């Protein structure tokens, strides 16, 4: 009122803990995709 | 050996463009002046707290790179020397050597009270009372520290001075 003070109920809570969730498929899926791409790529190379 | 010097020929800074060669060399100067004003490359020479405000000019809020301003670590690749901090007697010989290693054309900016006149440490036994005692200063930026906008204003003043250079028209008219 005659000063700078927080509200009666106080401020809402904030986020300060670490928030870095993992993303993407499992590593095995990426490995299979690499092998699938290599297999199909050599197939088209062989045809040519 | 008779010499008849005209008496009322205006000086270069006041001399208007009369013939075709005046516009030619003025075009030559403006192309160079625009290039040097646009490619404003200071040298990374942060000494004290004045350097922190110099870093915030490169901060995203002001982004000195948007004006073509890039800080170079070597005096060879820089044409602007920004003295941002206190110059001590132990540091003064190093400052002079670095200044001499900058190829011409070169300009010096004195930022903050330390570089201008010593500021808080004017009456100190180990502080130079102004960087102008060692190197010629083209513009003085006041403040302790000068704000990021204060430094940018000083750079704008220097760029205004650079755009008024008449190096090649001076050769045509004054030499």
């Amino acid at each position: 009122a005659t000063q700078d003070l927080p509200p009666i109920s106080g401020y809402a809570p904030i986020q300060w803990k670490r928030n870095l969730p993992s993303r993407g498929f499992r590593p095995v899926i990426w490995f299979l995709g690499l092998c699938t791409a290599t297999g199909y790529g050599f197939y088209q190379i062989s045809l040519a | 050996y008779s010499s008849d010097l005209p008496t009322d020929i205006p000086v270069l800074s006041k001399r208007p463009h009369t013939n075709l060669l005046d516009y030619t060399f003025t075009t030559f100067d403006k192309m160079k002046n625009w290039a040097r004003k646009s490619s404003f490359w200071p040298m990374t020479f942060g000494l004290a707290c004045c350097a922190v405000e110099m870093m915030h000019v490169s901060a995203p809020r002001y982004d000195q790179d948007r004006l073509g301003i890039i800080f170079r670590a070597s005096p060879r690749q820089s044409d602007i020397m920004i003295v941002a901090g206190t110059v001590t007697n132990k540091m003064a010989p190093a400052l002079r050597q670095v200044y001499d290693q900058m190829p011409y054309p070169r300009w010096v900016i004195s930022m903050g009270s330390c570089a201008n006149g010593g500021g808080y440490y004017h009456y100190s036994y180990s502080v130079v009372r102004g960087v102008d005692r060692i190197v010629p200063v083209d513009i003085y930026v006041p403040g302790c520290p000068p704000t990021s906008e204060a430094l940018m204003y000083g750079v704008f003043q220097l760029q205004k001075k650079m755009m008024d250079g008449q190096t090649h028209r001076m050769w045509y008219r004054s030499y």
Partner: protein, 55 residues
Amino acid sequence: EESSESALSKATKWYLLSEIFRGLYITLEMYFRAPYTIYYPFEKGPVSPRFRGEH
């Protein structure tokens, strides 16, 4: 012998640079965000009545 992840799983992340592409993706996100730059001298930063400048 006490690793939680298999050798193939640890090799897939290592060979395919799992965390490097994660770092690249975060940097690309900022490329599609609004910058912070203001256009001095056409625009000015915030000032307060307590600010100290020319006397």
